[PDB]
Symmetry: C4
Subunit: 283 residues, 4 copies
Amino acid sequence: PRILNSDGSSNITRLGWLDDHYHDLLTVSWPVFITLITGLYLVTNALFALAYLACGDVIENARPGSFTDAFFFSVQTMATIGYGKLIPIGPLANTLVTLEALCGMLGLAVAASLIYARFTRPTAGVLFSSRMVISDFEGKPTLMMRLANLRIEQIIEADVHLVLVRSEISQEGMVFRRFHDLTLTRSRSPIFSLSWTVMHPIDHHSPIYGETDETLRNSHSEFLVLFTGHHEAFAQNVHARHAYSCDEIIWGGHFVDVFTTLPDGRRALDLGKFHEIAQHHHH
Amino acid sequence: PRILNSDGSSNITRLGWLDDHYHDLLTVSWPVFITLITGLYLVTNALFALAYLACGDVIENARPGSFTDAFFFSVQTMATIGYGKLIPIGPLANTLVTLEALCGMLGLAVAASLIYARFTRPTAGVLFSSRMVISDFEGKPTLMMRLANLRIEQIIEADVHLVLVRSEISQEGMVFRRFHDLTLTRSRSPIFSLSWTVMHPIDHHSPIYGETDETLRNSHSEFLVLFTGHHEAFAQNVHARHAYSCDEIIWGGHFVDVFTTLPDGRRALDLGKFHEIAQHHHH
Amino acid sequence: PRILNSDGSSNITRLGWLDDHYHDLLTVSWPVFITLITGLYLVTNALFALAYLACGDVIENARPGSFTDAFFFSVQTMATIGYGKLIPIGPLANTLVTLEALCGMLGLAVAASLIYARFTRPTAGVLFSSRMVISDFEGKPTLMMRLANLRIEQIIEADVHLVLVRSEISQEGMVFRRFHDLTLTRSRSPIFSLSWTVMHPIDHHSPIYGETDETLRNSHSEFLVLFTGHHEAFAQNVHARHAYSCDEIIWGGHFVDVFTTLPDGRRALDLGKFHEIAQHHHH
Amino acid sequence: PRILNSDGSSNITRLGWLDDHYHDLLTVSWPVFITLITGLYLVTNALFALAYLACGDVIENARPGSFTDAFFFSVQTMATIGYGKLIPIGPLANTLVTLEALCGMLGLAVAASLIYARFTRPTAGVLFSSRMVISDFEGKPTLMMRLANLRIEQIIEADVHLVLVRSEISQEGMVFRRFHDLTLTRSRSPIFSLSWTVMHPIDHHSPIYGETDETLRNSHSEFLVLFTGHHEAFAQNVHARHAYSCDEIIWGGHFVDVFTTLPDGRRALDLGKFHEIAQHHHH
Ligand SMILES: [Cl-]
Ligand SMILES: [Cl-]
Ligand SMILES: [Cl-]
Ligand SMILES: [Cl-]
Ligand SMILES: [K+]
Ligand SMILES: [K+]
Ligand SMILES: [K+]
Ligand SMILES: [K+]
Ligand SMILES: [K+]
Ligand SMILES: [K+]
């Protein structure tokens, strides 16, 4: 019954047409988006066609009062194919022409931006260790997890937040969900390129100080990770979030190592070991 | 007589043609913007038409020395419909043609950017509690208000500023308007997704320490909120501002709660309670 | 003989073809940029024309082996006007056609981006007080200057740096130019909308502590201001820089005030007073 | 056998089709990218051609059941040249027409964004001193290197990180690679315009305190520099990274100076001296 999902998205039921047009257009599925555009496209040409007929027989080589002919003329006109069978006749016909044109291009201009707006979304090639571990490092127990960059490109000024979320009681006795950002021994990495093992020493300042497993379940406490950085691949900012539950903390565990020396004598990164955590079993 | 409006825009009278072209183009209303473009469009084609006539009878199937014909030819040419009745004749005619073309496309290129520039403005789906409240939390009186995200998408590295604005006297006795940023118990939220109740503990460091209501009215003091964050919906930064007056502070009040358990046993968010503030009435 | 100009640009002589293509294209003057594009345009069509002739007489209604005809055909083809007199003949002709097309549009795609890239540059509507002043505020002498927003739109999370630049001697006796960022009583303004008077208290920590005018000239010291913020007008970041010389510091001066009450009883901002500094003359 | 290359890219062997489409399209070489586009272009027209034939003899002046004719018609249609020899016949023909059109433009819209996305990548005109030096400045030994801006345009809010990377042993005896950000006497430069000499004083807090050369080789320690700032040229953010090995530290060295006075009496910047480091040789 987790508040937060693994993908880091909160797991709550929300209780609440043309209002949010721009968001909606970027939020819709490509199929749908394309449909909408299409609809709009067809629609407007039909409207234009009517405008033509409305004048009456103003297009060369058009079957008299036939909408199809007018419609297809309108497309050839608005897409500026301008084949040349169907042609404007008289001032009214042409004005509508020079109006459509502009309309068509403006539409392109609007379509483009939408396309580009929806199209240009990078994704940090970042992978999160499936588990966290609590274990002694440099003489203090430390909570850690680790990120691996999945692409050859590097992430610049990358940095990460480790946030504990759990239920608390106020002195006034208000029982709420609170967020604690957890001090990391290293929160910035100006050049993230291969793997980064993030650590929160646990000492008298850690909100998880002197806490066992049972105490963690008890406050229904989870751990939220936000990673962000500027990706050289996209020359644009990227982010990635992940969440862990009390039970994905492997106490006493140690992340295995991912840095190897090849037979060749060349250093390497093995991402098979990435999710592997060493453990002592005491019968 | 408030200095700051609810929308957060300052409420002052300012005392001050082609100077600010780019701003103006992004600032104008869509109707107007479209008009301007249109004007420009029509205009330039007329100019081009004249260029054609100026050569004299250089277009196939054009009524001799008729501007309409030339004009419409110019559009068919510049929009590149190129129907094919009206056609260039001779070097002069065509050079103008190949010039227009380029002109037309450049215009498209310019129109597009404007369109996209004006079109691509997101808006944080963020809603501000209509009121603030001053009340004891964890043993210190605290000023608070709260934000609710209005969309399913999440806001990353969101953060908020609570700024007190009020009149002060210098030792030198200059009576000015000063801004005090108010320390919040939590000013960053790397993953804002549902509701956030922001708090400024009031203690010996709060510029509103040991201040009653009467003292607040007296310094004609308001409270300004700036929220900002990176919206996953738009993959782009968003912001939202709000302002409160001395009298929108509900002393002793407590925001009601918006987190519920459904019959289903599924957690939920009710935004009807969002503006509701509990209060003790003592006859 | 100032190191830094008023516009904030350093005032030094630098001592140092296709190398920096992208920068150069955004850096060139519009006239030039347009020329380049034009050149490129004409050029490529000529090349294409030759390709056509090279096949030999492959265009309907083209004077045999005439470059003009081929050239103009090439434009009508690459701009996709496609009038219809000149037409491809045979596989070779048309392949070149379908190649040009694509070429043309790609060019548009490239032109557009350049245009948009160069076109979309906002400018903070920000005006800098022509002078600084050193005067007592709240019981410490303070260096100040002030910014006024020149537009109705607001600047968000605006902030400013006041940097002293002057010559110094190391213990080792290296005589260099050093930069001192000067602590401001207020360095962030989350919502900058009208005027902001920036202040650097001078106390035992100010690098300009117990410094007279003569001492300032002596270190050939200037003051550099960088302002930056997110402009609502453009929904994009803006910046502005300014520089002051030792002699634009008006000692004992006080900026006059720009906030007024109208006859109407409505508050206002007068930017005529903006550059005016009060002063005591002692015969 | 360096972990980090001079260009700042880590020097490790990584061990790991349509999966990463967007990255891949921005990552591919221009030749390849253009090819892909071309392929896609040709391909789709062929598909469309088949659609036409499939209806059977629906294009004016087309050799019966000939794919070439159909293909070339399809291009003239999708690029909207619309010459006018080949023309649609009947509802089926034209519907396909009005479909292609839209398709073509959408493709343009998609191509454009890619182009612009890949095209609009600035590069900080920044040059890194080929060496570092350790030498006494203001009475403490200091590690330094220096950056020179290579262009007339200025970089705003520029800042730099000096990161030591070397092997360490935990109390628990885990022998890992750790990153130490090194405190710089000056880490921000709001207006970087000519040269900046960055310094890390070495004192009891420097992770390189009381370290000789032999000790540096021994921890196989390198130094990584990340520079970033907002480039006025591009009105966009830029970055640059560099790395140094233990042996590119010139102990006792002093960077020569690059600031000169011309015969004219005008100040100047000489970038020939930029890589030159003074040194005392003691036989
Ligand atoms: Cl076990
Ligand atoms: Cl009451
Ligand atoms: Cl005087
Ligand atoms: Cl030697
Ligand atoms: K066309
Ligand atoms: K077009
Ligand atoms: K056409
Ligand atoms: K035609
Ligand atoms: K664009
Ligand atoms: K952009």
